[PDB]
C-alpha cells in the first residue's frame, strides 16, 4: 500500500545571539541515505537561501559561506532524520528553516522558525 | 561542465503548467534523457497529497534505464481518492484507471484559486457513461452517444441516449469536496537501452551549484 512523502522540521525557537540550536527533519516515504538532502532558509525580506547539503549515498557535506564553521548537517539513517547543528547564531540567521530532498525536483518540508536576538 | 538546458528534466513544467487536461483526455508527458533542475522546488504547502506505492520517490533520479510518465488532469476534491490502486467510481471506471499492482506516486493539490471562477468554470470535462470499465492506463476520447436503455439511439440524444462527456462546474464558493484538484501521477517505464543523458544515484557533485 501507500507511503506518504513528507518532511517535518522541528527544533526552532528563540535564542539570544551567540547561542546554539539543533534542528531536526523527520522524513517519511523515502530513506534519507538515498537522497541528496539539504537545508535552506526563508528570510522575511529575502529570497530562498541554501545553507547546507549532504550527498546521496555518501558523506560529503556543503555549506553556504555565511554559515561555514557554524552549522553542521548530519544524517541519522536509522531514525530517517536529518539535522542542522547551528552554533554561534547571529541575528541575521533569523529565518524559517526548511529541509528538502532531491527527488527529480526538490521537495521540502513545512518550515521551523528561528529567531536570534 | 554543465548540462544543456535542453537536458534538464521538465518536472517544473508539469507542476507549473498554466492549463491542465480534462480527466477523460488526461495528458501524459514522458520525462526521459535528462538530469535534475536544481532550481525546481515544492514544499508541503504545495501539495495536499504526495503518496508513493511500492517505490521511493528517489527513483525519480534514476533515468539511465527508466523513463518517467507524468499523467496530469483536473478532478473534484472528493474524487482524488479514486486515483489509487483498487478504486471504483466515476473517475476510476470511466476516466483514469490505476492498476491493482500500481508502482509510482500520486500528487494532488487544491486548484480552486486557478480553476474555479465566479458563475462556474465549465471547461473541465469528465466521462459520465461507458459500456465497460477502463483497463489500467487506458484512455477513451470517443464522443459517441451512450445507449442507456434497450432502444438504439441512432446518434440522437434523448431519454436513455446521452452525450457521454459532462462539465464540472467549479465555483470558488463550492465546498472543498467540489473544488477542483490538479493531479499528477508519476509512473516508470523500464528501458532496454541506456539513456543518452542521465545521472547516477550517488551524487556526482552537482550540489555545489546551490552554493555558487
Ligand atoms: C511554480 O509553482 C511554484 C509552486 O506553487 C505552489 O504549488 C503549486 C503546486 C500550487 O499548489 C500553487 O497553488 C502554489 O502556489 C511557485 O512557488 C510558489 O509561489 C507562491 C506565490 O508566489 C508562494 O506563495 C507565497 O509564499 C509566501 C511564504 O509563505 C510562508 O511564509 C509566510 C510568512 O512569510 C507564512 O505566513 C506562510 O504561512 C508560509 O509559511 C507567502 O508569504 C505568500 O503570501 C502571499 O500570497 C497569499 C496567497 O494566498 C496571500 O494570502 C498573502 O497575503 C500574500 O499576498 C505566498 O503564499 C509559494 O511559497 C511558492 N512555493 C514555493 C515552493 O516556492 C512558483 O512561483 C515562483 O516562485 C515564487 C517564489 C514567487 O516568486 C512567484 O512569483 C514565482 O512565479 C512557480 N513558478 C513559476 C515560474 O511560476
Numbering used by the authors:
A (entry chain A): -2 to 114
B (entry chain B): 328 to 539
Task: Quote the authors verbatim.
A key step to the SARS-CoV-2 infection is the attachment of its Spike receptor-binding domain (S RBD) to the host receptor ACE2. S1 binds to angiotensin-converting enzyme 2 (ACE2) on the host cell membrane via its receptor-binding domain (RBD), causing conformational changes that trigger a secondary cleavage needed for the S2-mediated membrane fusion at the plasma membrane or in the endosome. Here, we identify and characterize a high-affinity synthetic nanobody (sybody, SR31) as a fusion partner to improve the potency of RBM-antibodies. In summary, we have structurally characterized SR31, a high-affinity nanobody against SARS-CoV-2 RBD.
To characterize the SR31-RBD interactions in detail, we purified the complex and obtained crystals that diffracted to 1.97 Å resolution. The asymmetric unit contained one molecule each for the RBD and SR31, indicating an expected 1:1 stoichiometry. SR31 binds to the RBD sideways at a buried surface area of 1,386.3 Å2 (CDR1, 204.5 Å2; CDR2, 226.8 Å2, CDR3, 519.4 Å2; non-CDR, 710.3 Å2) which is significantly larger than that for the previously reported sybodies SR4 (727.4 Å2) and MR17 (853.9 Å2). The binding surface is near a heavily decorated glycosylation site, Asn343, which, although at an apparent strategic position to possibly divide the accessible surfaces for immune surveillance, does not show clashes with SR31. Peculiarly, the CDR3, which contains a cluster of hydrophobic side chains that include Met99, Val100, Phe102, Trp103, and Tyr104, is inserted into a greasy pocket in the RBD that is lined with twelve hydrophobic/aromatic residues. Aligning the ACE2 structure to the SR31-RBD structure showed that the SR31-binding epitope is distant from the RBM. Structure alignment of SR31-RBD with ACE2-RBD revealed that the two RBD structures were overall very similar with a Cα RMSD of 0.45 Å. Specifically, the small α-helix α364–370 (numbers mark residues from start to end) moves towards the direction of RBM by a dramatic distance of ~8.0 Å and transforms to a short β-sheet (β367–370) which in turn forms a parallel β-sheet pair with β102–104 in the CDR3 region. In addition, nudged by the CDR1, the short helix α383–388 swings towards the RBD core by ~4.0 Å. Remarkably, the dramatic rearrangements did not cause appreciable conformational changes of RBM, nor did it affect ACE2 binding.
